[PDB]
Fold this protein.
Amino acid sequence: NDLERLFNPSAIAVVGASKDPSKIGSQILRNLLSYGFKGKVYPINPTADELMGLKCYPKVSDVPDKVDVAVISVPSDKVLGVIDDCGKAGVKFAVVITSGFKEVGNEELEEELVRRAHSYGMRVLGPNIFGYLYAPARLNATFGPKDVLSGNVAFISQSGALGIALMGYTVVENIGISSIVSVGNKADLDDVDLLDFFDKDPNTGVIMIYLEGIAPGRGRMFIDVASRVSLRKPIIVIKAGRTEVGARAAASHTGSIAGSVAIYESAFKQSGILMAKSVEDAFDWTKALSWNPIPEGERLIVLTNGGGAGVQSTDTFADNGIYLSKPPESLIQEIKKFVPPFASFANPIDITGMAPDDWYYMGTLAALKNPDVDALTVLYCQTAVTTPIGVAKGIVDAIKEAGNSKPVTVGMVGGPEVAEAVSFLNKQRIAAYPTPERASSAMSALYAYARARSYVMKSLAVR
Amino acid sequence: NDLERLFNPSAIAVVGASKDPSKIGSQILRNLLSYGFKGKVYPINPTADELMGLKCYPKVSDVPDKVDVAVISVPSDKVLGVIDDCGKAGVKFAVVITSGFKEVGNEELEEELVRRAHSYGMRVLGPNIFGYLYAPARLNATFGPKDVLSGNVAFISQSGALGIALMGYTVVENIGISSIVSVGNKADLDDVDLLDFFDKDPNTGVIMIYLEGIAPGRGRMFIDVASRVSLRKPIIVIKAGRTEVGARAAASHTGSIAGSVAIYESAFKQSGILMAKSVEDAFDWTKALSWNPIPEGERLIVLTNGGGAGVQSTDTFADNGIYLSKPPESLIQEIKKFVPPFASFANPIDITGMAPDDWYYMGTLAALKNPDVDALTVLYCQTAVTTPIGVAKGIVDAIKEAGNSKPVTVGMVGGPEVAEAVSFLNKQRIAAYPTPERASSAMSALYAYARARSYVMKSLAVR
Amino acid sequence: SSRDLLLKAKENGRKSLLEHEAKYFISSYGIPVTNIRLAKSEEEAVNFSREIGFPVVLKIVSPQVVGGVKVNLRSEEEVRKAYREIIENVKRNVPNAEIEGILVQEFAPPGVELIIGLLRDPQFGPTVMFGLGGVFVELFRDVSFRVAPLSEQDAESMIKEVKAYKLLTGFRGMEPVDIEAIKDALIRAGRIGVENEEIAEMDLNPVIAYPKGIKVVDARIILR
Amino acid sequence: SSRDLLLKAKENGRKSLLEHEAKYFISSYGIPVTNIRLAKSEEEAVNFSREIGFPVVLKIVSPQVVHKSDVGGVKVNLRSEEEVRKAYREIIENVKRNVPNAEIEGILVQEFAPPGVELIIGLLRDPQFGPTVMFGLGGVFVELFRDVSFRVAPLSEQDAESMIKEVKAYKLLTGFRGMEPVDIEAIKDALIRAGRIGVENEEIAEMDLNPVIAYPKGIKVVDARIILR
Ligand SMILES: CC(=O)SCCNC(=O)CCNC(=O)[C@H](O)C(C)(C)COP(=O)(O)OP(=O)(O)OC[C@H]1O[C@@H](n2cnc3c(N)ncnc32)[C@H](O)[C@@H]1OP(=O)(O)O
Ligand SMILES: CC(C)(COP(=O)(O)OP(=O)(O)OC[C@H]1O[C@@H](n2cnc3c(N)ncnc32)[C@H](O)[C@@H]1OP(=O)(O)O)[C@@H](O)C(=O)NCCC(=O)NCCS
């Protein structure tokens, strides 16, 4: 079933808005308007005639318009009533904020909600969610932050509080968002339906999912869909319940049985999915995949001032099954024009600690231009000889003057000035990090996805 | 082998200072005065009459004083000359900045440097180092940042550029430093000699080491000393060369043969040492160990709003061999007075996402006061219902009002307002982190050290 | 018509296949098995033992169910001793059962033992499991999983996943085994699960791997 | 003392201890070994086998032939005094033809060792940390998978116990199909004494206790290799 009208609705209704601006229904209404929804918004309230300067209606079906989406923010004992009115009004999607369903043991009520919805040809998101956001439609139907950075990352969250928090965290980590979707209890619409939409969506290039579990009998379809998506768009899953003890903890908070850990891991491999063990990993990888093409080969080059950062990088890469190889002679000789003879060209390429700013420019440029180099990680350790910002600008210039598009991550270590340089680089969608390991972990994700894509390609090879 | 006069010298000489403020010798000299050394400083230069407003001398032996330490910043072909003069002047410690020794193949020269020094009863730090710093003596004999935050952390670095950079990084991560020591080539003084000093030093409470390798026949002594220190002070080692390929890379940059990876890992275990695989881990742990006592029991309590963060935390703790247990009934009952009945008390204790600011105070207070609780990790996910700073202040108040000292880590997830709250907490030496996994990893380091200390105690038990 | 075996079983209230019916079934899917026939007496058995080739081993085949196994019957005249002894052994040790007969089983040379499993995961449906036999699954739990249907890529990689993989690539007193035959078996195992909804789980244990080809020695098929 | 074996060897240019000398040595440190005696004739061989108990294994003890199994200088499972004489002469017959001028110190009589869980205990000298004890389960688990643990000597009881639990094959010691749990305390004991040997005897470059068999009570070293320097 097509979700075009959910993400790009002509008209949306907010049921549960109130004169009280504190209530959740009103918070949603405020986000819609502030984020700049260009369609029609119809507040629904039993008493008010006007909310937020918009004509309010007692019921959705009293609205003289075709309402595509209805955000339901009323207590659980009132939800079924609204569903019928919505069904009568021919609304196609009910976005149910309301809690008090399967997660608290009342599974009977949830199954009824979905049943009555379907009888009207209506689909249900949630329930027990914080809404959803779609940047390409200037649509913020959540009670989270009023804003996000625009970009190509879709985030699907099965967690409420964490999801709504991570929504705000994306700004701090400079991640561009195309969509935020709280899926909650997944009583009806789930990750498979959404993956199908984001597969087609030219605005979404990366998909990140916080996943606690999928519905029984849904896993096979999940692999078929995810697997085809992985061919063109990387999927990162933050698995809640990677351990036996954690699986049971997630099962409780969710209100469902815990599936097999080992089998979930296999399904992710068969789908070409990258599994992250932590929020930081997910966001670090996401940032790199969102801003870079896949490496076309294994000729990875590490560039550093001093061996310390290089060795940390070499260890990190090796932990991810990536092993550096001797660099092209054409590159070495290009660098040997300014670098002292005693320096190391074993890869990582050490240009010595006392190296000035322009050496980062020349070395980064030489590396990218060279046709035998597929990818580049640049590591910088702050010293009195350099300026962190001058190094960052040298790297920016070398990217633009290379006149190409090769994957590149940056790791910068130092004081307050380095924090600024790193921020500066990320503002220009260049994956930069405050440690060499994290920069090496980011680059490793690019290679992990390449190899994951290759896995699926071989898996679909025709007999 | 007494290093009291190295870290707490009455008089220090800087050989290699110049009228040219750009040269390294001058950068060192500038740091000594800026950091506020209260002792006597003696610039040494063949011609100058006064550097930095200080009477300069052509050579150390011409100084009308007993010089404890000499920082040597002259080319390698002049170092031996200066050593002889220092020896004549009865200098106890030669701190040799100069490069161009064993790391570039000139091992003969290095062994000669040490030999001639020893003949005068003089000790050598380095060579090939960026100097050292000791906060309790207001002594900054480096050409790195002019300042650091004061605290109880000693940092020993075998890497030059990474070490000097990490020195600056400590400020960003709000780590209080007692000492920075560049050991470089370890031609003479090494980690064993330094561990002996920091063992006795009442200013140092945590010791962090960037370690590429140990000298042949030195490892046995290393375990005896390190294990003994681990009994009272935690030691974190960032091992460069945790992999075969990385070991070789570290070996090159160092100019020495690579030792066995598995055997280093064993030695660290026998020494009660925490091995970090990354800079972020090391600093995250260091921060927690520096600001907290070790837990006296396994009664760890996680406090969270919404299961999402709780499950990430449960997974991380389990990955580190820590498993949460049912909380004390007294605690559940104390919390159940404001928390809804449906909430989860399985540990993590979920107080629901829509929990207001005050609930973090009440819950953190109740947890710390309860005599059956040994340690506490508080997780927070930003929502419109709370204020990140109000939550942080609630936690500060509860710690102060609990009137005790139990280990505590905080994990906060959200936008810019969370970034400030986290900074605020670390500013008050409360270990706070921007993700639940990192906060859970920090707390795991406290327990890892407890168990590491217990390991050494049992190995030293009298049969 | 291979499905006749599952239908006749469901008809007779049985929730699993007898040892021989289970092998016939997986053999119809192209998974190599040790050759067998089920004895309806001693006379049928000895001739059956005469029929499939020597030496031959005897077991017990009854939906009910210890000391019901023999070894190395060399001669057609000799065979007579062991059958009676089993039916002599069973009654003294255990009184009641409908005995479909005694299995006349082909001898299997020693080799590298394997485990191939089929289970139904609630989320992902039919899933194939792999691992090396002996202590490596029973004790260490060194197994890999793939959700069916299996591609050749899935089969190849799940084999290399296990930590005991090197036991397939040659070691002390043991030459490398036919990995292609294993891959083939794993894919057909997955096919059995996808196609037969009435199979709840399947255990191929032990499966022996040789330099060329493999042999399922015992097969367990549970119904639902 | 025990060091006489190490000294006489250094004197005779040898860089290792003969199989029997290696066992006498580790036995003097309290590491239980498979019982053995050195036969100087046909007559002595019979009385020792009578003394050690049947069955018995025989080997040639000579510094020249490095491997005894394929030269034809080993006879397994000799149950009777008649069997040993047969096997005794066959060895002295195989030996002369395969090597005429080897120096035969005698024939070794080995106690049969019941089957059990095979172990490996090693002693190596690391450049950084000096004498180090290695542990791991025998067979494929070390030769193939390389599943070993290390501890730097001297070993405490704590070191010994934890390095045993460190290995991934540990569960082969806690009982499994057709095998009762084995004496972990005896293993700990042996590991500590192995480390002591390394610390005290600088002239030992490496030591391999392989195979070591572990029983529900006690253990027995079946073969020991001590390399010198
Ligand atoms: C960050 C996270 O934790 S996300 C997790 C997922 N979501 C949650 O946790 C939500 C938790 N809260 C709930 O589930 C609640 O039941 C909510 C938010 C749905 C409703 O709470 P409230 O706002 O207090 O409900 P309330 O009863 O006040 O109804 C809201 C408004 O809708 C109105 N309303 C009630 N019934 C109807 C109806 N049939 N049609 C239209 N409006 C209606 C009410 O009158 C009220 O407006 P008013 O102020 O004019 O009277
Ligand atoms: C030590 C090092 C910095 C010296 O380089 P430099 O500053 O250019 O050396 P110079 O030749 O200019 O000597 C420095 C000053 O000491 C003076 N000097 C030389 N020999 C001297 C002596 N025996 N006694 C006193 N002063 C002496 C020089 O005259 C000069 O002073 P000036 O400018 O007034 O003439 C350099 O050899 C080096 O090793 N650099 C790398 C350091 C490094 O990377 N360390 C590792 C941590 S990252």
Q: What stands out?
A: The first helix of chain D runs from residue 3 to 11. Residues A 15-16, 18, 20, 23-25, 44-47, 73-75, 78, 81-82, 97-100, 128-130, 160-161, 164; B 306, 353-354, 383 surround acetyl coenzyme *A (ligand 1) (CB under 6 Å). The radius of gyration of chain D is 18 Å. Helices of chain D lie at 3-11, 19-27, 42-52, 81-98, 140-143, 157-166, 184-200.
